[PDB]
């Protein structure tokens, strides 16, 4: 009946913590260089009886992944050739795409050369014909090295020793809330850092029903994340058979111009099976109605955020999603979507610099699982009359939340003090 | 055997019988091939793990328990910390809600432990004829 405190080391106690995580890969400059190869077999230990609160929107793993992708992007772009001198005045004629001849410094400082390259309409603007690249008055530009690949490969985010990652294994788990079935892991599953807007590509699929996750459903300002239970298939091709012309512009420097087109005058596109997309859209509106219906396109000016922007084989595609979002619901024939291509992109020109995606020789074709979506409501009208949904891809972090929704970081507090009827041996 | 943190939801005694699994799997060692942002990260994380481990070992030693795991003290359990009897604590609560209930008074208990151990050692110094 006399109680004394006793120290316990290694008690199952953890607290919510934000720490600097590290990467893991095994099979591409961004992740093949990565860090330490993953363990041959990961240990996922189920924790019986344990119910833990998750919050995907206040998660720090998302911000960590975001800054890590940004820093990796800069580290891989730094050593490559910067096309500062390619801002010469351009004389352009019609072949959209334009044949532009311009002077260029040769290897010898005194000599100059007149070369020609093919440029997409989005890359060039006229001034007073004479033209310039659109970026030259906003920012400098650097050309992505041809060897490095923009293909996302799975990167596992790991917690250090003394910390742990908690993984919710609840199939119907909402974005935030108490998870009745929790297991612990040292590293997450293989997450491909697919850069995308609007529809999500190559993600992980929710089991049982498709999942709708927001920070606040009734708030229009907060986006809507959609995760499929069944993946839809989307085939994207750039049919133009482009050619790469390496023109030397100095000692070592070499610009990769677009040669004359070989083949058809067709623009890149993506097909999606109409049957599967109709089933998926039906299940989507069913889970939408679980909290409440038409779908319309978003029209906001910036082409790279209004269109399903992504990267495929090294070319950056921007896709008209109007075929997917023209609908109204009150409960193969594959649809085809047009995609334009940009080689100059500025996702952070102000933070840093712009990137020139080098042209890809030949026809391009990639097959992608479309696992998710990112939506947004309109401004609140007369209540409960009608609800309209337009697709957005406003930020890249929502993709990280889309794959980090199940994970959470905690630090182990192995020090527990508890009362027993025990006293140390008297001196 | 359930694995690391396997008894997190178990009764405090059921988890207490297998604290050693959690305590052992607390320190890793994940080699390298960094020979970069990733390297800075891996190096920084390396330090923090053994740093927390050594802070905990420091606390264990300054309480007379450098041998780790299970040890007893001369500090009586002041009823103001928690009013529950032995059966309730060891067979009704898990370690998580326990540390939640006692987090208000943890540091006071730590101070009582360090001071009781220091007085024991002063007695040891007195303890020769």
């Amino acid at each position: 009946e006399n109680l004394w405190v006793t120290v316990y080391y290694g008690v199952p106690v953890w607290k919510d913590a934000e720490t600097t995580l590290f990467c893991a890969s095994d099979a591409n400059v961004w992740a093949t260089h990565a860090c330490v190869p993953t363990d041959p077999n990961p240990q996922e230990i189920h924790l019986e009886n344990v119910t833990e609160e998750f919050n995907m929107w206040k998660n720090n793993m998302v911000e960590q992944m975001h800054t890590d992708i940004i820093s990796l992007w800069d580290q891989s772009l730094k050593p490559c050739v910067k096309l500062t001198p390619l801002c010469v005045t351009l004389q352009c004629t019609n072949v959209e795409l334009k044949n532009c001849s311009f002077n260029m410094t040769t290897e010898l400082r005194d000599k100059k050369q007149k070369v020609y390259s093919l440029f997409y309409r989005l890359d060039v603007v006229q001034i007073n014909k004479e033209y310039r690249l659109i970026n030259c008055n906003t920012s400098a530009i650097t050309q992505a090295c041809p060897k490095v690949s923009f293909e996302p490969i799975p990167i596992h985010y790991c917690a250090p020793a003394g910390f742990a990652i908690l993984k919710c294994k609840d199939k119907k788990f909402n974005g935030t809330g108490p998870c009745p079935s929790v297991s612990t892991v040292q590293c997450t599953h293989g997450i491909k850092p697919v850069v995308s807007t609007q529809l999500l590509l190559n993600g992980s699929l929710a089991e049982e029903e498709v999942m709708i996750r927001s920070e606040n459903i009734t708030n229009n300002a907060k986006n809507i994340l959609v995760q499929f239970n069944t993946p839809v298939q989307i085939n994207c091709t750039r049919p133009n058979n482009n050619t790469r012309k390496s023109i030397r512009i100095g000692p070592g420097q070499a610009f990769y111009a677009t040669g004359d087109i070989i083949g058809d005058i067709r623009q890149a596109h993506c097909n999606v099976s109409k049957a599967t997309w109709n089933e998926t859209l039906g299940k989507v509106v069913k889970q939408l109605r679980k909290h409440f219906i038409r779908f319309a396109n978003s029209s906001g000016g910036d082409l790279e955020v209004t269109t399903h922007s992504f990267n495929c084989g090294g070319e950056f595609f921007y896709c008209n999603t109007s075929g997917l979002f023209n609908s109204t619901w009150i409960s193969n024939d594959s649809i085809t979507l047009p995609c334009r291509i940009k080689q100059i992109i500025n996702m952070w020109q102000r933070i840093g610099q712009a990137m020139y995606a080098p042209p890809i020789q030949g026809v391009i074709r990639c097959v992608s699982n479309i696992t998710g979506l990112i939506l947004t409501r309109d401004g609140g009208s007369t209540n409960s009359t009608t609800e309209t949904f337009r697709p957005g891809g406003g930020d890249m972090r929502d993709n990280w939340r889309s794959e980090l929704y199940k994970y959470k970081v905690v630090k182990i507090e192995p020090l527990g003090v508890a009362p027993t009827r025990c006293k140390r041996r008297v001196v | 055997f359930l694995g690391f943190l396997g008894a997190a939801g178990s009764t405090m005694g059921a988890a207490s019988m297998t604290l050693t699994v959690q305590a052992r799997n607390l320190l890793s060692g994940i080699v390298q091939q960094q020979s970069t942002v990733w390297g800075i990260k891996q190096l920084q994380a390396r330090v923090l793990a053994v740093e927390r481990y050594l802070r905990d070992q420091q606390l264990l030693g300054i309480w007379g328990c450098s041998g780790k795991l299970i040890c007893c003290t001369n500090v009586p359990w002041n009823s103001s910390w928690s009013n529950r009897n032995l059966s309730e604590i060891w067979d009704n609560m898990t370690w998580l809600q326990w540390d939640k209930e006692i987090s208000n008074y943890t540091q006071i208990i730590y101070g009582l432990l360090e001071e009781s151990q220091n007085q024991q050692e002063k007695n040891e110094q007195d303890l020769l004829a």
Partner: nanobody
Amino acid sequence: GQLVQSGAELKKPGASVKISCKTSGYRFNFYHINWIRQTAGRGPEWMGWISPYSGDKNLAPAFQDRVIMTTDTEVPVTSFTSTGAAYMEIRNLKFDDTGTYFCAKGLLRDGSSTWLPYLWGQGTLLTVSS
């Protein structure tokens, strides 16, 4: 935590009746849920218990063939509490089955008296008459 039982039902002899027991303020999955009755003629009588976690049931021999005990899956509230629901359906009612029925949460998660009814609900009055 609070245990809230269904209100009251009037049933004719030979019929069946289903009493509910909704829980909150504690982890429903952890503590056993017992069903005990009280009649004026025979006094207090323990009927059985059921585990919300495993589904294991233990019925007294007098009610093994006419009483059905069920539980739902716990609905999490925070982490250390939840809401749940258990049901007991008693059939072939007789006049001596008239009385008050209770569901009750157990005492300890482990030990020598895990199922021991510790936290009781307000009771459901069952009347068998014509």
